[PDB]
Amino acid sequence: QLVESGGGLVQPGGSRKLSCSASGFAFSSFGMHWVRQAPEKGLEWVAYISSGSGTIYYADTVKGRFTISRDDPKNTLFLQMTSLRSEDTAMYYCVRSIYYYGSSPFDFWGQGTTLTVSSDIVMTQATSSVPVTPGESVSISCRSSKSLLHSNGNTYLYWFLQRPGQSPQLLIYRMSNLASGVPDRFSGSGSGTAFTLTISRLEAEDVGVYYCMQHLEYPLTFGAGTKLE
Amino acid sequence: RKLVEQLKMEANIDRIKVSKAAADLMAYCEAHAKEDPLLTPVPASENPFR
Amino acid sequence: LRQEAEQLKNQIRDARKACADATLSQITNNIDPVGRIQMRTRRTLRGHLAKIYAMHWGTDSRLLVSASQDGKLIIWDSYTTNKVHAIPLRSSWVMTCAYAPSGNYVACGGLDNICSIYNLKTREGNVRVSRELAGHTGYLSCCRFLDDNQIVTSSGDTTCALWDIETGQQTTTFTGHTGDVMSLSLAPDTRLFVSGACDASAKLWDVREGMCRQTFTGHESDINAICFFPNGNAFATGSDDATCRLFDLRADQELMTYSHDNIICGITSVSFSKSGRLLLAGYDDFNCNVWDALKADRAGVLAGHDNRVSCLGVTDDGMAVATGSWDSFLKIW
Amino acid sequence: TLSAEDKAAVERSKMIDRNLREDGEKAAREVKLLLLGAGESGKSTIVKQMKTGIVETHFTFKDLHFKMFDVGGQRSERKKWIHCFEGVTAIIFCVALSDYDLVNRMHESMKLFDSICNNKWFTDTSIILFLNKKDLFEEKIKKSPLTICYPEYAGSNTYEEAAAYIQCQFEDLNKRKDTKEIYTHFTCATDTKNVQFVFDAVTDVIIKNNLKDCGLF
Amino acid sequence: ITEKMLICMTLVVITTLTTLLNLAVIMAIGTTKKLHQPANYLICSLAVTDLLVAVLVMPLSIIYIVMDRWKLGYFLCEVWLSVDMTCCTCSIWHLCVIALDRYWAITNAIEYARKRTAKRAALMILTVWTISIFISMPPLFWRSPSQCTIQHDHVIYTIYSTLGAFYIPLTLILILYYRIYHAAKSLYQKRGRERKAARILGLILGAFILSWLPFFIKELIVGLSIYTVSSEVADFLTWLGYVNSLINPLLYTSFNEDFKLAFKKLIRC
Ligand SMILES: CC(C)CCC[C@@H](C)[C@H]1CC[C@H]2[C@@H]3CC=C4C[C@@H](O)CC[C@]4(C)[C@H]3CC[C@]12C
Ligand SMILES: CC(C)CCC[C@@H](C)[C@H]1CC[C@H]2[C@@H]3CC=C4C[C@@H](O)CC[C@]4(C)[C@H]3CC[C@]12C
Ligand SMILES: CC(C)CCC[C@@H](C)[C@H]1CC[C@H]2[C@@H]3CC=C4C[C@@H](O)CC[C@]4(C)[C@H]3CC[C@]12C
Ligand SMILES: CC(C)CCC[C@@H](C)[C@H]1CC[C@H]2[C@@H]3CC=C4C[C@@H](O)CC[C@]4(C)[C@H]3CC[C@]12C
Ligand SMILES: CN1CCC2=C(C1)c1ccccc1Cc1ccccc12
């Protein structure tokens, strides 16, 4: 259970501290991220801190303007923002992710908090809207500039589903594996460049926006997002 | 007495001749000989350990 | 009375001798010898700081789990040597471990008389003990998973048990051994299993009913390891008399004995190759031997362990052999 | 060569290695003792003074941490798990002085101590031997002389001479006197002095091991 | 000529033996997984210094004593004579610091094992290296053809060098090993063989006092202009230290069963 706080109205050029409090899992062994979503655009990765704070990465758009830190004894993940621009307004999501063999990164996403202010792999998801009816299969296509099939066989592509008015949840990891608790309906397939997510026996709970992210290397870039209704 | 009971049950099982047993073991080993990476040194291309 | 037993023993020995028309040596004398086997140390898993007593490969032939006197299991990624997990144990005296066929749970036990099961795919992230399986009144030798719910277990209580993890108690207790039972081996179809004990006997047990289906003797000392032939119709035992043996379930007798004058040291672990042609026996002379299971000829030697080779395993796809020794290092060949 | 997830997995492995090294150092600073004896040998009394299967008793004395492993709950073959205790720095062998007049168990203690002191694994592990139930012996020796236990005894039927004969028998049962040593002691129904003797024996073993590493012994 | 050839062959044999033994000790320490202790790290550092002497100083001495000519240059001779002092004093202070380590491990074992770390061993090696550097370098600062030898410029420098390089380590080793021998009685008499420990400590002290004492007493008697020194006695006493370099790994390693089993493992592959 991740919950964030510290958002709201901020004067441009100011500074704000975002606090992510975690309860119910081993924070020490969990890498943490910070993914912001524009009020109308798709998700965009912002920051990442590893387990033990030994590794820290930032988005090249906002590199050096943000400082992400961990307090394992306090069990809290902090992100300090300085000199905000008007484009920085977004809703920020605290994202859990643990990396080992067979793990499921980006499995749990925080509820996110809003904040309003006055050579990277590009993923294309041009199929913006798909009119669908319940009980019928649907296919969502994503494309990558660089092949995601790494030399070790892992195809680092993640499919997330964001319900209207709900935080995103992991749906499929590594283009084939199904996240724990996800219905068996969802399937992932595709080569190292073109990827497909197939849903069979669609029900109402499937309404939302589907995002394709790449975890091959940083920065992690999401797709535009496909809206199903 | 329980020991003798177990005995009588173990004495009432069907038997297979050692010739047939050896024939079956040799047949299994020969049939699966190609799919044994330990017997035949696997090439390093498809060898996961390097 | 006891004279009736003795007469039944004589009758069963006569039946076995009558059924033993030929021997595996002369039946397979004509087959081509496998030749010398060279096995390099492909990987060296280091990070254990005490004697290693057991390990088990995962069903995916990549992950493995090892137990030592460190007071903690270690789950290794054998392909890249990374330590996937490090599970601190309640008792440091662990002499067995197992990796579930589904890859979700990992068991370990020892002098605490408890085969503790740990959950690997928990939501909280840290591996936690799901169940504390107690009820054995002696030291714990080897507990092996059947599936995610059932687990057979062999202890020094002279009995083997079949616990249900969901409820936490035994559903069938296999009794009949005279001394400490030190080894287990599930059949590939997982319907029968052989347990070797310290009374120089290995018993074929049926899990579904519980009675001792068969008994096999011929060793002259305590049996320390056992492993089914991949066909599931034979099994090799390794005892303290420096001799391995290959018994047949259908013939109800041994077929081959693996020994040499040079080796005067007991066998601490036994495993088979994927095809069953090779028998890898890790001895207590700081090394391992590789026997032609059809010729009893020492097809290879695996040296490199500074101490006793206590545990030995072969990947489910037969791609690699991992031997863990008392020098606190695993070696994947 | 290594993708982002592989790099983070390697970092996690390195963190696990750090934690394992710290735990290993902490466990190596520990002092491991193996407690052995008969069922009525007073080991329960001794562990009470310092405080299913194996029983771990952890205590601290003079900033030294002692873990005593009692294997009284193991009724299986001793040799099948005795190799697990190679690393114990000492074996606290408790023997009761009331075992000489109640039945055959004195010979059981004799054979058990002989086997323990002549194991191939314990060829270099010192044995701290405790003589428990000495107060009862001091007055029951007059009622039952030690000649009843051992007719070969030839001396005054006094508690001092009987104790000397016992600590001569136990040391004569030793075979590795040049490598190991038996530190015999009498409980005297006190705790602090017993723990002080155990600490002295342990530090003596440590200094002997350091001299052995130096090449002197 | 025949005598000169015999001397050259003997010195080549000596330096080859030094190199082989130092390499064997280093390989055994680096390969055996039971010898990763701070004391073994100190012994390995001593072996490294010994190998430096063996493969950087001994051949130059061999060629110089037979050629009686140094064509390598005045700067090269200065570098050789400075690195010789640096590395020999480094070896002597490794002997002293190993004696100190053993004194700690025997007298205050209970907490010294707690406080003993590879970081502490590295600090000790750093200390001996810096003290050797401070002893040897400043001649290159202030004191700076056919034959070049020790330059006796300042008697104060000579006495400083000899006291800091051999006399202080000698008295430290004597005191520490005397304390160790005194403490060995506490586990020999107050508990209940003294011959073994006495022989080992006597052999260590005898080797140390037999190799580098003649050279340094000669150094004093030639730095105070007492007696003249001939080339034969001068280079014989010089090579006495290299003989110590040869015997050092044997003396400081052969008395451990762990090192013995490491050697047995390393002589089978
Ligand atoms: C100048 C060179 C050639 C000298 C010889 C090589 C030296 C530096 C090498 C050889 C073996 C090495 C050791 C091998 C193993 C270990 C254990 C590790 O946990 C710490 C480092 C340590 C202790 C190494 C230190 C460096 C070492 C001593
Ligand atoms: C060769 C001379 C002239 C140059 C200086 C070499 C120095 C930097 C080298 C030589 C031997 C080295 C030591 C060899 C072994 C160990 C043990 C291990 O814990 C790593 C540090 C430590 C303690 C090393 C520290 C660095 C060291 C002291
Ligand atoms: C600094 C100038 C004057 C040179 C001094 C050289 C001599 C006298 C110095 C150099 C390093 C010194 C040692 C450094 C550390 C210790 C450990 C300490 O527990 C006792 C003293 C002792 C053993 C010192 C004794 C004196 C010593 C050997
Ligand atoms: C000029 C000086 C250096 C001469 C020194 C001579 C004496 C002290 C040396 C020379 C050869 C040495 C021996 C060489 C080899 C061994 C075998 C080893 O297992 C124990 C030490 C022992 C037995 C050494 C003891 C010391 C020794 C006898
Ligand atoms: C015998 N080796 C090489 C010669 C030599 C040595 C040792 C030395 C080493 C340490 C301290 C003092 C000295 C004395 C000294 C002085 C000046 C130049 C060289 C030397």
Side-chain angles (χ1 to χ4, degrees), chain A, chain B, chain C, chain D residues 1-113 115-217, chain E residues 1-142 144-269:
Chain A
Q1 193 214 0
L2 289 157
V3 65
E4 312 95 332
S5 290
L9 201 42
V10 57
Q11 183 67 221
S15 175
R16 194 61 91 101
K17 175 83 140 203
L18 278 194
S19 179
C20 176
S21 63
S23 59
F25 48 83
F27 195 96
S28 304
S29 47
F30 279 157
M32 298 305 281
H33 293 245
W34 267 102
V35 172
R36 89 185 173 191
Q37 172 175 1
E40 294 293 328
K41 284 152 261 303
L43 305 164
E44 191 216 340
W45 176 73
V46 160
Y48 159 70
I49 186 161
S50 172
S51 52
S53 308
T55 292
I56 299 160
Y57 294 131
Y58 297 96
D60 293 19
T61 302
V62 299
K63 177 78 171 179
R65 287 210 291 98
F66 299 159
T67 317
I68 179 179
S69 54
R70 268 163 75 105
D71 220 346
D72 306 357
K74 283 203 52 44
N75 210 297
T76 307
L77 166 77
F78 294 107
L79 187 150
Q80 182 44 289
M81 294 182 286
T82 59
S83 82
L84 301 184
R85 324 161 200 290
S86 178
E87 67 97 13
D88 194 328
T89 177
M91 195 166 159
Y92 286 71
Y93 296 105
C94 195
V95 183
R96 183 180 79 177
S97 83
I98 178 159
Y99 303 100
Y100 55 85
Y101 175 70
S103 77
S104 56
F106 285 70
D107 45 5
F108 196 59
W109 288 46
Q111 213 54 20
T113 179
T114 175
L115 184 140
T116 176
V117 65
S118 188
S119 63
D120 298 335
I121 296 90
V122 298
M123 321 275 288
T124 48
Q125 192 175 0
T127 308
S128 308
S129 179
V130 186
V132 294
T133 55
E136 193 65 32
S137 170
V138 69
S139 182
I140 293 157
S141 287
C142 187
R143 294 211 71 261
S144 158
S145 162
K146 174 202 281 223
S147 76
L148 301 176
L149 182 44
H150 196 70
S151 301
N152 50 41
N154 283 313
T155 317
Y156 303 97
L157 187 153
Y158 293 165
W159 285 98
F160 305 93
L161 158 69
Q162 195 207 352
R163 275 76 173 261
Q166 192 202 319
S167 66
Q169 79 181 78
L170 176 63
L171 185 63
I172 279 178
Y173 59 101
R174 289 193 201 86
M175 182 206 58
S176 293
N177 309 115
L178 198 75
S180 300
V182 175
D184 184 16
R185 296 175 292 170
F186 306 92
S187 72
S189 48
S191 71
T193 311
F195 309 79
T196 52
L197 165 73
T198 300
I199 316 174
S200 311
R201 314 161 270 151
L202 201 163
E203 289 92 7
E205 209 181 356
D206 282 291
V207 61
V209 187
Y210 296 80
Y211 292 103
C212 49
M213 198 204 67
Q214 56 90 25
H215 208 302
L216 183 63
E217 61 186 40
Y218 307 97
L220 320 164
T221 60
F222 289 74
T226 288
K227 199 175 292 171
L228 266 70
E229 70 261 13
Chain B
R1 73 286 83 180
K2 264 78 75 178
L3 175 151
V4 195
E5 302 158 12
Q6 307 158 3
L7 265 51
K8 55 192 51 53
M9 188 276 282
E10 280 148 34
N12 299 341
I13 62 170
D14 201 355
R15 301 270 144 168
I16 284 288
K17 273 153 165 37
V18 176
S19 51
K20 187 181 190 298
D24 293 0
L25 283 193
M26 173 206 87
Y28 184 92
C29 281
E30 201 66 340
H32 286 57
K34 277 74 69 177
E35 311 156 60
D36 200 338
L38 292 202
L39 293 166
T40 66
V42 63
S45 54
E46 71 275 59
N47 189 7
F49 301 88
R50 293 175 181 178
Chain C
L1 291 164
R2 50 215 73 78
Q3 54 278 2
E4 181 186 10
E6 168 61 41
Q7 208 274 337
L8 261 62
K9 277 163 182 176
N10 181 34
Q11 175 254 310
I12 198 73
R13 184 171 31 51
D14 280 315
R16 288 176 176 185
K17 196 167 288 184
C19 292
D21 55 63
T23 57
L24 182 65
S25 309
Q26 53 184 290
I27 301 299
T28 60
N29 180 76
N30 54 17
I31 197 65
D32 291 331
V34 298
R36 194 61 170 52
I37 300 298
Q38 320 270 341
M39 285 184 142
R40 282 85 171 93
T41 308
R42 297 288 177 206
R43 301 268 194 283
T44 303
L45 315 178
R46 64 181 31 101
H48 273 307
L49 300 163
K51 305 140 84 171
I52 302 175
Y53 293 79
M55 52 95 77
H56 205 247
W57 279 100
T59 188
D60 49 343
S61 177
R62 172 160 184 171
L63 290 169
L64 66 92
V65 58
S66 71
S68 57
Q69 309 314 85
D70 298 327
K72 63 179 72 175
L73 295 146
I74 302 180
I75 302 173
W76 306 83
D77 177 15
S78 53
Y79 281 15
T80 76
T81 311
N82 304 139
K83 294 189 179 57
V84 176
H85 281 114
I87 320 170
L89 296 195
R90 293 180 181 177
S91 162
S92 163
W93 316 104
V94 63
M95 42 172 48
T96 185
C97 69
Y99 209 102
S102 84
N104 294 292
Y105 304 71
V106 167
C108 66
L111 301 175
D112 200 18
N113 310 338
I114 299 186
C115 180
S116 297
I117 294 89
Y118 299 83
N119 199 338
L120 305 192
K121 319 289 198 47
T122 176
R123 197 96 178 114
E124 279 85 63
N126 49 354
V127 290
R128 54 166 161 79
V129 71
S130 176
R131 205 83 61 223
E132 285 282 327
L133 286 193
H136 274 307
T137 69
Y139 82 101
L140 195 61
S141 296
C142 195
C143 48
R144 286 269 182 278
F145 271 89
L146 262 71
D147 63 50
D148 279 339
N149 189 28
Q150 277 149 13
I151 172 172
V152 298
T153 305
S154 161
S155 64
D157 192 0
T158 62
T159 56
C160 300
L162 169 64
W163 317 74
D164 273 28
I165 306 166
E166 65 183 1
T167 180
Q169 52 205 26
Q170 326 185 16
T171 65
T172 299
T173 303
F174 312 105
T175 181
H177 288 283
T178 319
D180 302 333
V181 184
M182 293 177 70
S183 66
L184 284 192
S185 179
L186 276 296
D189 55 338
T190 310
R191 185 47 48 69
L192 283 75
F193 75 101
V194 290
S195 58
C198 287
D199 64 308
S201 85
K203 276 184 160 52
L204 182 63
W205 300 97
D206 192 319
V207 285
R208 284 311 110 181
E209 293 83 3
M211 78 282 287
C212 167
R213 264 287 162 199
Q214 287 185 37
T215 174
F216 310 90
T217 48
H219 275 300
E220 294 294 328
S221 185
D222 306 330
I223 285 184
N224 316 294
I226 195 150
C227 182
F228 262 97
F229 194 83
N231 183 31
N233 270 319
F235 69 102
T237 69
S239 62
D240 275 350
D241 55 23
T243 67
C244 285
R245 277 160 205 276
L246 186 142
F247 307 100
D248 180 12
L249 302 193
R250 297 187 288 180
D252 199 7
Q253 40 188 325
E254 61 166 30
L255 307 186
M256 189 66 72
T257 184
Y258 310 106
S259 60
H260 201 251
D261 291 331
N262 189 359
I263 43 174
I264 50 170
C265 64
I267 295 92
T268 299
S269 64
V270 174
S271 179
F272 264 104
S273 179
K274 178 170 177 63
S275 62
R277 186 54 192 268
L278 290 189
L279 190 154
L280 285 89
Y283 286 70
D284 52 1
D285 186 74
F286 294 0
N287 80 98
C288 173
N289 275 332
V290 180
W291 304 88
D292 206 343
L294 265 57
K295 314 281 290 315
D297 284 297
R298 200 188 325 193
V301 176
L302 267 61
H305 281 301
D306 306 302
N307 218 323
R308 183 200 314 264
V309 167
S310 178
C311 60
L312 193 142
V314 176
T315 44
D316 291 331
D317 56 2
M319 208 70 80
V321 169
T323 76
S325 178
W326 278 12
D327 63 340
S328 82
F329 294 130
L330 289 95
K331 286 206 193 302
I332 294 146
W333 316 77
Chain D
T1 47
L2 299 179
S3 57
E5 305 213 31
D6 280 313
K7 289 180 182 178
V10 173
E11 185 192 320
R12 164 199 187 77
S13 164
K14 289 198 89 205
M15 271 200 62
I16 283 175
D17 278 327
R18 256 197 292 281
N19 287 322
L20 261 54
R21 185 191 63 227
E22 293 173 13
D23 291 331
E25 276 177 2
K26 191 161 101 70
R29 286 190 292 104
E30 278 287 347
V31 166
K32 291 172 70 175
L33 312 164
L34 165 63
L35 176 73
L36 278 166
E40 314 96 344
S41 70
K43 66 177 72 66
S44 65
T45 307
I46 312 295
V47 303
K48 183 60 69 59
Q49 303 174 60
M50 283 74 74
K51 206 72 168 189
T52 68
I54 198 171
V55 187
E56 266 193 19
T57 302
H58 193 132
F59 69 96
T60 301
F61 198 64
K62 309 271 190 97
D63 290 344
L64 199 43
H65 294 327
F66 300 83
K67 313 164 96 53
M68 301 209 297
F69 316 118
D70 176 5
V71 291
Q74 289 287 345
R75 292 287 107 185
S76 74
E77 279 186 355
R78 192 175 322 282
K79 59 159 159 59
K80 300 289 94 175
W81 48 266
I82 208 68
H83 55 64
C84 304
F85 295 100
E86 281 206 329
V88 299
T89 189
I91 300 163
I92 297 165
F93 206 106
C94 282
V95 164
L97 283 72
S98 66
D99 294 343
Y100 86 108
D101 48 348
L102 194 150
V103 291
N104 185 37
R105 63 180 65 188
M106 72 296 277
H107 312 133
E108 296 178 350
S109 291
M110 291 315 78
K111 66 159 190 142
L112 173 44
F113 192 84
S115 61
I116 289 303
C117 83
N118 297 337
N119 290 318
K120 46 181 271 179
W121 300 268
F122 301 146
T123 181
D124 278 348
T125 73
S126 300
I127 297 170
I128 310 163
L129 196 156
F130 268 89
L131 279 299
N132 184 297
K133 309 211 160 183
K134 79 164 298 181
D135 291 307
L136 274 79
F137 182 70
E138 283 190 1
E139 290 83 4
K140 77 182 149 55
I141 177 178
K142 317 182 190 72
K143 263 80 75 177
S144 170
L146 200 66
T147 59
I148 285 168
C149 174
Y150 284 139
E152 288 82 1
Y153 176 44
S156 163
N157 43 68
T158 174
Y159 60 99
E160 290 289 337
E161 191 36 50
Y165 189 24
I166 294 173
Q167 53 104 20
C168 279
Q169 291 180 355
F170 273 110
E171 273 69 348
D172 291 331
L173 260 69
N174 189 290
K175 194 191 81 214
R176 278 285 192 261
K177 311 170 84 165
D178 62 358
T179 74
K180 83 173 79 179
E181 196 163 6
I182 294 171
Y183 311 128
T184 176
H185 182 234
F186 298 83
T187 67
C188 202
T190 178
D191 165 64
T192 317
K193 182 265 289 181
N194 284 331
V195 186
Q196 188 274 331
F197 179 88
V198 171
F199 168 63
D200 291 331
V202 164
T203 189
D204 204 288
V205 172
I206 301 299
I207 304 183
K208 282 195 192 321
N209 264 268
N210 277 2
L211 291 174
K212 265 182 189 178
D213 203 78
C214 170
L216 312 193
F217 166 67
Chain E
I1 308 173
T2 318
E3 298 146 334
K4 267 73 67 179
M5 295 298 102
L6 189 144
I7 297 169
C8 181
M9 183 177 176
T10 294
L11 295 200
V12 175
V13 164
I14 289 305
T15 183
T16 46
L17 260 66
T18 59
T19 300
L20 291 181
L21 288 168
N22 294 347
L23 192 46
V25 175
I26 278 164
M27 271 305 128
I29 292 177
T31 44
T32 300
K33 301 314 220 195
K34 199 134 77 172
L35 288 180
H36 301 267
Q37 315 184 352
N40 303 321
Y41 305 158
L42 279 160
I43 298 185
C44 178
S45 166
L46 171 60
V48 163
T49 289
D50 201 77
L51 188 153
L52 292 169
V53 165
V55 299
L56 190 149
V57 172
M58 293 180 183
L60 275 79
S61 171
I62 296 169
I63 62 170
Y64 174 77
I65 65 153
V66 59
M67 289 313 80
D68 291 331
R69 174 281 311 150
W70 180 278
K71 194 62 176 64
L72 277 296
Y74 188 84
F75 189 77
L76 277 296
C77 170
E78 290 299 317
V79 176
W80 181 55
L81 287 180
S82 193
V83 71
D84 202 317
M85 271 175 48
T86 312
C87 190
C88 281
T89 308
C90 169
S91 189
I92 300 185
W93 278 94
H94 276 88
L95 308 186
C96 173
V97 76
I98 291 188
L100 183 68
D101 185 10
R102 288 170 167 172
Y103 172 65
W104 294 140
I106 301 317
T107 289
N108 209 20
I110 306 100
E111 51 266 50
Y112 173 68
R114 175 183 321 297
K115 83 183 70 159
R116 171 140 76 165
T117 49
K119 182 255 295 179
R120 194 201 201 61
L123 182 133
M124 288 192 167
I125 302 162
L126 213 64
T127 307
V128 298
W129 270 117
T130 80
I131 189 75
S132 310
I133 294 169
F134 284 175
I135 284 187
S136 66
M137 289 326 198
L140 191 148
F141 283 51
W142 70 268
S144 199
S146 72
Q147 269 195 23
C148 70
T149 57
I150 296 89
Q151 294 178 355
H152 289 73
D153 197 356
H154 272 197
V155 290
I156 189 66
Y157 160 76
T158 296
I159 183 164
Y160 162 97
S161 78
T162 182
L163 276 296
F166 174 70
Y167 283 159
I168 297 169
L170 170 65
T171 187
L172 271 179
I173 291 172
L174 282 174
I175 292 301
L176 291 168
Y177 272 109
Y178 166 72
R179 293 261 171 270
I180 283 172
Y181 188 59
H182 167 273
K185 312 321 201 293
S186 297
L187 316 171
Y188 282 160
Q189 319 293 342
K190 274 312 311 203
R191 182 51 254 170
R193 174 160 71 269
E194 62 279 358
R195 183 191 310 270
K196 192 52 189 315
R199 214 161 50 112
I200 300 311
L201 294 203
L203 198 151
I204 285 177
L205 289 201
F208 186 57
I209 193 66
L210 173 63
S211 179
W212 291 99
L213 178 67
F215 179 73
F216 278 84
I217 62 170
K218 176 196 71 63
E219 199 88 15
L220 277 182
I221 69 173
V222 307
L224 312 180
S225 170
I226 306 302
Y227 292 166
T228 183
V229 55
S230 81
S231 169
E232 293 179 349
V233 293
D235 65 1
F236 169 62
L237 267 54
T238 298
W239 267 90
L240 206 56
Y242 306 133
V243 170
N244 189 359
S245 286
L246 188 153
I247 63 170
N248 203 0
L250 294 174
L251 172 43
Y252 263 96
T253 291
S254 81
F255 292 165
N256 259 326
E257 292 268 41
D258 218 340
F259 281 100
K260 280 174 245 167
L261 60 89
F263 284 168
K264 297 303 121 176
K265 169 209 172 92
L266 268 295
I267 63 176
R268 287 189 172 193
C269 284

